[PDB]
């Protein structure tokens, strides 16, 4: 069920979220109009298994072919690292890693808007990341990750966007999904409240135009239906006394690493 960990296991999941973090900090400075998509995962795998010894979880993870998920602009998730895809100006790119270290796993992602931005994608980025950001403020000891789900999706479709349905959070730890499933919209199946010790992933997929979506015939990459950007920002947190702890906070992050709800 629903697993408490320890303060030891606690500190390899700090290892673990720093690692993936620093992947996407590392990553930053290419992300540049003209670079390929697969290029970005050989830089990145590469740096994952010879700078910090760690493995990506996503690699063969259901025969998936390559170490981290780059998703552009109309791309939902899962999207294929490859050779022939090119960034380009105004295009928002998820990259979403995934690191295995010491029997632990460090899971987060992040939106880059490459060249020249455009303001609907700029709009768009914001306002999931502030979706994170909201829920995260909410996770504390008592609290029901359906009144999250709830609060997620209110806000984003207070500004005209939707909550993709199909996937969600995961508890996290020695395995990559684990309990409890943290869905990011209201639904009458969640009741988990919330423990000291609890390690879970928030990760809101937020579409621009319907919530719908497709997968295309190459088995792996998601669309939305309508052709509508898509975008998504995920940490992985543990949950504490007064509130929680994000594990994968990085330097451009705006919201405290320990959030405390105590007087
Ligand atoms: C290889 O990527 C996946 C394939 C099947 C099911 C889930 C995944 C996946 C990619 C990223 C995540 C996550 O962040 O939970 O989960
Ligand atoms: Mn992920
Ligand atoms: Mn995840
Ligand atoms: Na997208």
């Not at 000891?141 to 005209?160: D, H, S, T, Y």
């Not at 209201?186 to 992933?201: A, I």
């Not at 579409?207 to 940490?235: C, F, P």
């Amino acid at each position: 069920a629903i697993s408490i960990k320890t303060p030891e296991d606690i500190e390899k999941m700090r290892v673990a979220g720093r690692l993936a973090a620093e992947v996407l900090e590392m990553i930053e400075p290419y992300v540049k109009p003209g670079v390929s998509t697969g290029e970005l995962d050989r830089i990145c795998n590469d740096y994952i298994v010879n700078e910090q010894h760690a493995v990506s979880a996503c690699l063969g993870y259901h025969g998936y072919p390559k170490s981290v998920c780059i998703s552009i602009n109309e791309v939902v998730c899962h999207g294929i690292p490859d050779d022939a895809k090119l960034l380009k100006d105004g295009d928002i790119v998820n990259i979403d890693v995934t690191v295995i270290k010491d029997g632990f796993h460090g899971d987060t992602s992040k939106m880059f808007i490459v060249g020249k931005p455009t303001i609907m994608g700029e709009r768009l980025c914001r306002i999931t990341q502030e979706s994170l950001y909201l829920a995260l403020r909410m996770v504390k000891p008592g609290i029901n990750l359906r009144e999250i789900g709830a609060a997620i999706q209110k806000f984003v479709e207070a500004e005209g966007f939707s909550v993709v349905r199909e996937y969600c959070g995961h508890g996290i730890g020695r395995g990559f999904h684990e309990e409890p499933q943290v869905l990011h919209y209201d639904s009458r199946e969640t009741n988990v409240v919330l423990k000291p010790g609890m390690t879970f992933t928030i990760e809101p997929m937020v579409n621009a135009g319907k919530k719908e979506i497709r997968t295309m015939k190459d088995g792996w990459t998601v669309k939305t239906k309508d052709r509508s950007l898509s975008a998504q920002y995920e940490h992985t947190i543990v949950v504490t006394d007064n509130g929680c702890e994000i594990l994968t906070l990085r330097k451009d992050d705006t919201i405290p690493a320990i959030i405390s709800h105590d007087e």
